[PDB]
């Protein structure tokens, strides 16, 4: 037998590489001066090819998938590079002369806003500007005559405003492999994200993934086929997150029932700070609604699945957050450009042994945030006047499990999260990158000439 080289053989092996993005043709037409990032990307394939790899079984590991990490780093960079040419609010750290909401009748959520009057710079370096704005309690902190206040980031980082041109609105994004590489896609209905897939495909691009940033509840994501699906890195490790994917979506209805005012305060030259004017309406704490019956149908289906891992007939308990940073103790998300922080005690407060109006979450709105545990770029989101309402699909959960076992007796579950990498995993679980090597050498009865 003689060695024979073959070019273009179906050989591949696991690899990590630099991907590229696609975002339709429709996501560019949106414009508004480059909403999200889509300005340099190439178009999504109109007729994306997904090819079933006949008789192919491949191992996947959703927890060690560099696609997740690349997406994370990209959206960080994206946020970083989209806030730089924008307005910079560093002078906005100024002694804030601030009182409670004057209120009226009677008491429900009192200190949710302040009236904060501050000396501010005009276009010019001479004459000050004595003017005011509205601020939430989460935005502003007291430090010790009426009470004295300052911005909550002022001892932490540097503030600079989101440019009113762009818009934080997830769009579907596809991730694609360059030449010589391929994405494999596992198509089995019941798949925990780790192990051998029997129906594997190859694609040029992922499905369109909206980079929805949220905690506790996963919104507008993909749902698992036929049945609610549970995914976790180590079921007996109480430190590991548990990702849940639903089969049936749960409608969630949120609203900011306050008409607002955009009061443009000029801190020039050229830099325009958008202040919060006043409240047009009754003074109302925002809220999110879920259908009790719908939420209850979901909880019924979720609990039964958990017992297959934790064993057959055990008590399953749902409870509220254990504590920690605000990012993880509430359901946080954005609506109409505004940042909601929602109390989920009403969502996670139930006990299920083996055998109808609205749920209202007392949300709170913060305007100043710095996600991704970055310290040293602060961001301010300007008020969006009008009634703010949004409707999303709850499509998954990020949960944690208590460590005090109760190991074969009962299990207790609480909402968790905080590592946004877990969000990306829930969509990318069925993908992994491999590199192609079209060479292969094989024996046969052919030999070349003299």
């Amino acid at each position: 037998l003689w060695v024979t080289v073959y070019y273009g053989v179906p050989v591949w092996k696991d690899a990590e590489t630099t991907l590229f993005c696609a975002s339709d043709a429709k996501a560019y037409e949106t414009e508004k001066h480059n909403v999200w990032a889509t300005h340099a990307c190439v178009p999504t394939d109109p007729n994306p090819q997904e090819i079933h790899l006949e008789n192919v079984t491949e191992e996947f590991n959703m927890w060690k998938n560099n696609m997740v990490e690349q997406m994370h780093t990209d959206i960080i960079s994206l946020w970083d590079q989209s806030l730089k040419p924008c307005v910079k609010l560093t002078p906005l750290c100024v002694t804030l002369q601030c009182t409670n909401v004057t209120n009226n009748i009677t008491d429900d959520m009192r200190g949710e806003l302040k009236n904060c009057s501050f000396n501010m710079t005009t276009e010019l370096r001479d004459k000050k500007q004595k003017v005011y704005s509205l601020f939430y309690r989460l935005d502003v902190v007291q430090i010790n005559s009426n009470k004295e206040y300052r911005l909550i980031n002022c001892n932490t980082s540097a503030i600079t405003q989101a440019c009113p041109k762009v818009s934080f609105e997830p769009i579907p994004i596809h991730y694609c492999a360059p030449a010589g590489f391929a994405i494999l896609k596992c198509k089995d209905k019941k798949f925990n994200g780790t192990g051998p897939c029997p129906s594997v495909s190859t694609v040029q691009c992922t499905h369109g993934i909206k980079p929805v940033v949220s905690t506790q509840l996963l919104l507008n994501g993909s749902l698992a086929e036929e049945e609610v699906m549970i995914r976790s890195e180590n079921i007996t490790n109480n430190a590991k997150n548990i990702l849940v994917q639903f089969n049936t979506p749960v409608q969630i209805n949120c609203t900011r029932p306050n008409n607002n005012t955009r009061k443009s305060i000029r801190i020039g030259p050229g830099q325009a700070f958008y202040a919060t004017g006043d409240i047009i309406g009754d003074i109302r704490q925002a809220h999110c609604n879920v259908s009790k019956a719908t939420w209850n149908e979901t909880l019924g289906k979720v609990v039964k699945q958990l017992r297959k891992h934790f064993g057959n007939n055990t008590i399953i308990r749902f409870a509220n957050s254990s504590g920690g940073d605000l990012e993880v103790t509430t359901h946080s998300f954005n609506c109409g450009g505004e940042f909601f922080y929602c109390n989920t005690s009403g969502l996670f407060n139930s006990t299920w042994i083996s055998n109808n109006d609205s749920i209202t979450l007392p949300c709170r709105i913060k305007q100043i945030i710095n996600m991704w545990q970055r310290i040293g770029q602060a961001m301010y989101a300007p008020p969006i006047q009008g009634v703010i309402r949004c409707v999303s699909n709850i499509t998954g959960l990020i949960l944690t499990r208590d460590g005090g076992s109760t190991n074969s007796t009962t299990e207790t579950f609480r909402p968790g999260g905080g590592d946004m990498r877990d969000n990306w995993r829930s969509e990318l679980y069925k993908y992994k990158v491999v590199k192609i090597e079209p060479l292969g050498v094989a024996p046969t009865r052919c030999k070349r000439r003299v």
Binding site: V3, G8, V9, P10, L19, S77, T202, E437, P443, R445
Partner: protein
Amino acid sequence: GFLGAAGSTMGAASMTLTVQARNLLSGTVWGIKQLQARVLAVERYLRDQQLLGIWGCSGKLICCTNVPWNSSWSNRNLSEIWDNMTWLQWDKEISNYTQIIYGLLEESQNQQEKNEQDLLALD
């Protein structure tokens, strides 16, 4: 299609040789993302193209060689490979000898071959 025969037998996967080499090319930050990737994409193409070239082939798809098969290379019969086996499973075996076999092609052959042709071309 692309990686169509990837799961079929090596003898059957010899039909999809045309599909793999075909789609192996395809024709302010966040634009450099695709740049550095498609640069490497070229480099990966030329690595194999050069290996293919410096060996007894340089024409794509298939070529033969004058290197005898060392039967300690995990020998199986011609029906136990092409019609009994898949290329990925095959790459899961000779992976050790891959770096070893490649060397016999570039030096022990073409350097031998084309110099053997030098002294026989003089007349």
